[PDB]
């Protein structure tokens, strides 16, 4: 699945318009045109060719469930406005000290906006 774009008809197939309220997968907007053939990367059984520098993520998706998630979960929203330097540092180090929540299918996807008073 790549979740392509229907170009003109996208306000229908937007996530919040199809009654999906959880943070959903994004849609790929610009389609890139390539030319010529594309070489084979695998074999008949589906195993990758030997040269082929592979990825580093797990072969299965990182669905981090209710027992694998870190305790004291960082908030989804953080805007660092009218907040002190110490509290801003505490919140930023919190969301940076929880790394695996940031890189997950059922991840956090935080919004880090604003700027504390020097």
């Amino acid at each position: 699945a790549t979740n392509y774009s229907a170009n003109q008809y996208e306000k229908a197939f937007s996530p919040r318009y199809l009654q999906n309220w959880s943070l959903a997968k994004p849609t790929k907007q610009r389609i890139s045109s390539h030319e010529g053939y594309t070489q084979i990367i695998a074999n008949d059984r589906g195993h990758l060719l030997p040269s082929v520098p592979r990825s580093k993520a797990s072969p299965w998706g990182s669905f981090m469930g209710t027992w694998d998630m870190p305790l004291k979960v960082p908030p989804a929203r953080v805007t660092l406005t009218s907040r002190t330097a110490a509290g801003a540092a505490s919140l930023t180090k919190w969301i940076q000290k929880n790394p695996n929540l940031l890189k997950a299918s059922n991840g956090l996807r935080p919004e880090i906006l604003g700027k504390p008073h020097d």
Binding site: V73, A76, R77, T79
Partner: protein, 434 residues
């Protein structure tokens, strides 16, 4: 296109829930069977037609202990709530936040988040998630935290109000309440949006003096909390003059990041006999919401300054009489107001007159509900701290928490951030002298 998922968590919740959804029903007609006795679409804010003419409540009652939810699965409203929306468990949580955010609570989280998703995948425009709990109990303080945090992971920056029963200013029905309360505020300080607070001691007096009920029980109180949930959601169910949605209460109240603890206060809470002698006029109803003897959270609003107050006039309220009242209350030098808030009085004038449940309260053709964020809630946080410390000093009743998954240290980090909260109310109070 104005639905509101309600997650009632804990005895208090399941119980305020019974009261809240009874009012919801009598208001739109939905009988104690779903089938509306019509022979129109307003009900969608809380109900979901199956097509067979059955309107199912949009809620998820959750309680690690049976009993409370089970009396709802065998009572007048036993055919309204879809079985899988009443999710109980097997073992309780012994007034121990620990076994509500760590052990006997992280088991029901998966299924509740599941049900919440289905009740969301049927909404054409969710407004928010009204979570009702009690700051002082296993599920009330434990499951809510876990639920709130996990919600934020999914539904990210989506509204998430929190009607709550704040620890009492003297009564209290537990010996470990103080702890659970401080721990809860910490895990929800950054994950909740606008948590409304109603103290029980307060409603108890408001019922002995204004509603002539000498011996009030939890039901008399619960039913008044249902009238407040009505006014907060009335605009998105009935027509009015100045509609107020559930995304504006987070903007026109919560001032700075942490500070997010508005207080509730109702109007025309009179009692038949004492209503044959009252013109319950917009002014009277408003002046009353600012009287330091009606604030449904014992916290004399005089010992503090107002930060933001959003009034909600439900009924026959001439728009002009509202502007007049707010003016009068502003002049009165008794009521105070911070300097960084010139305009601090928000107004919502709906039209549907308060609904009368065959039970108590008078039939008023006008009523207001104020939701101010007074800096006078600081006294409450200080009192909660005196308590937390009087015990933490001897690490009393902590064995139980370390006896679940709460590393002793967490207790410290909690009260330490509660001290930060108190220091915040001092700054947001002081008025620039420049």
């Amino acid at each position: 296109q104005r639905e509101c998922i309600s997650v009632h968590v804990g005895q208090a919740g399941v119980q305020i829930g019974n009261a809240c959804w009874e009012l919801y029903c009598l208001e739109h007609g939905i009988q104690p069977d779903g089938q509306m006795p019509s022979d129109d679409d307003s009900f969608n804010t809380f109900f979901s037609e199956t097509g067979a003419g059955k309107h199912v409540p949009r809620a998820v009652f959750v309680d690690l202990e049976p009993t409370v939810i089970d009396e709802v699965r065998t009572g007048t409203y036993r055919q309204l709530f879809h079985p899988e929306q009443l999710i109980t468990g097997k073992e309780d949580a012994a007034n121990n936040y620990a076994r509500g955010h760590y052990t006997i609570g992280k088991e029901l989280i998966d299924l509740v988040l599941d049900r919440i998703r289905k009740l969301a995948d049927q909404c054409t425009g969710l407004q928010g998630f009204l979570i009702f709990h009690s700051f002082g109990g296993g599920t009330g303080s434990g499951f809510t935290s876990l639920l709130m945090e996990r919600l934020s992971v999914d539904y990210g920056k989506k509204s998430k109000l929190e009607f709550s029963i704040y620890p009492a200013p003297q009564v209290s029905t537990a010996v470990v309440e103080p702890y659970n309360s401080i721990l809860t505020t910490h895990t929800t300080l950054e994950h909740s949006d606008c948590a409304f607070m109603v103290d029980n001691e307060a409603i108890y007096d408001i019922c002995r003096r204004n509603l002539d009920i000498e011996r009030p029980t939890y039901t008399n109180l619960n039913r008044l909390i249902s009238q407040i949930v009505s006014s907060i959601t009335a605009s998105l169910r009935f027509d009015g003059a100045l509609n107020v949605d559930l995304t504006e209460f987070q903007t026109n109240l919560v001032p700075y990041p942490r500070i997010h603890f508005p207080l509730a206060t109702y109007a025309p809470v009179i009692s038949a006999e004492k209503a044959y002698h009252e013109q319950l006029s917009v002014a009277e109803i408003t002046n009353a919401c600012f009287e330091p003897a009606n604030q449904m959270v014992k916290c004399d609003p005089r010992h503090g300054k107002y930060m933001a107050c959003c009034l909600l006039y439900r009924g026959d309220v001439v728009p002009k009489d509202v502007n007049a009242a707010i003016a009068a209350i502003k002049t009165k030098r008794s009521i105070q107001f911070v300097d960084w808030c010139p305009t601090g009085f928000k107004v919502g004038i709906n039209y549907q007159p308060p609904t009368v449940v065959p039970g108590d309260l008078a039939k008023v053709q006008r009523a207001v509900c104020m939701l101010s964020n007074t800096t006078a809630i600081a006294e409450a946080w200080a009192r909660l701290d005196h308590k937390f410390d009087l015990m933490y000093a001897k690490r009393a009743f902590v064995h139980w928490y370390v006896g679940e998954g709460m590393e002793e240290g967490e207790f410290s980090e909690a009260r330490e951030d509660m001290a930060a909260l108190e220091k915040d109310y001092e700054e947001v109070g002081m008025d620039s002298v420049e």
